[PDB]
Amino acid sequence: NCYFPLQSYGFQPTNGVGYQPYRVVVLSFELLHAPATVCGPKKSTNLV
Amino acid sequence: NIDGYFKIYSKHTPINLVRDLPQGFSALEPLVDLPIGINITRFQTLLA
Ligand SMILES: *[C@@H]1O[C@H](CO)[C@@H](O)[C@H](O)[C@H]1NC(C)=O
Structure with a gap:
């Protein structure tokens, strides 16, 4: 129940919309x- | 210093004057305006 607070994003070109x-x-x-x-x-x- | 605008007016003239402020009339043209917003209450002059 110790947790590191950050996580990275699995940004791959094959990801769904x-x-x-x-x-x-x-x-x-x-x-x-x-x-x-x-x-x-x-x-x-224009000036007239 | 009006509503945050620090305004400078100035003039130059040639003189031939020993040790006084010369009697005469001059009109100071505005040279710069600065939107600095700061309060001012005190000042000094810087000399060589
Ligand atoms: C300028 O001075 C006035 C009165 O002393 C004060 O009400 C105001 O908050 C001041 N502004 C700043 C930026 O210090």
Whole structure:
């Protein structure tokens, strides 16, 4: 009943859809408590 | 230092002046603005 806490993933190309590996990114962010230092692109168009 | 923005204004002029601050009029143009957010209350100047 001693157990090592980690285990490795058997990622093989023969795994079924599900047991195959998936890469993940979580874009986490905390909002509106400091001066803005990231924004989406403020799109622009031709001068007439 | 306003709402997290540290703002610098400045000017240069040539003089021929012995030991005083010269009587005259000047308008300081803004040179940089820094979104640093830090509180300031104290300061020093660094000399050669
Ligand atoms: C700046 O100072 C004010 C008052 O002393 C305080 O309420 C605020 O939390 C301070 N901010 C930081 C980042 O230290």
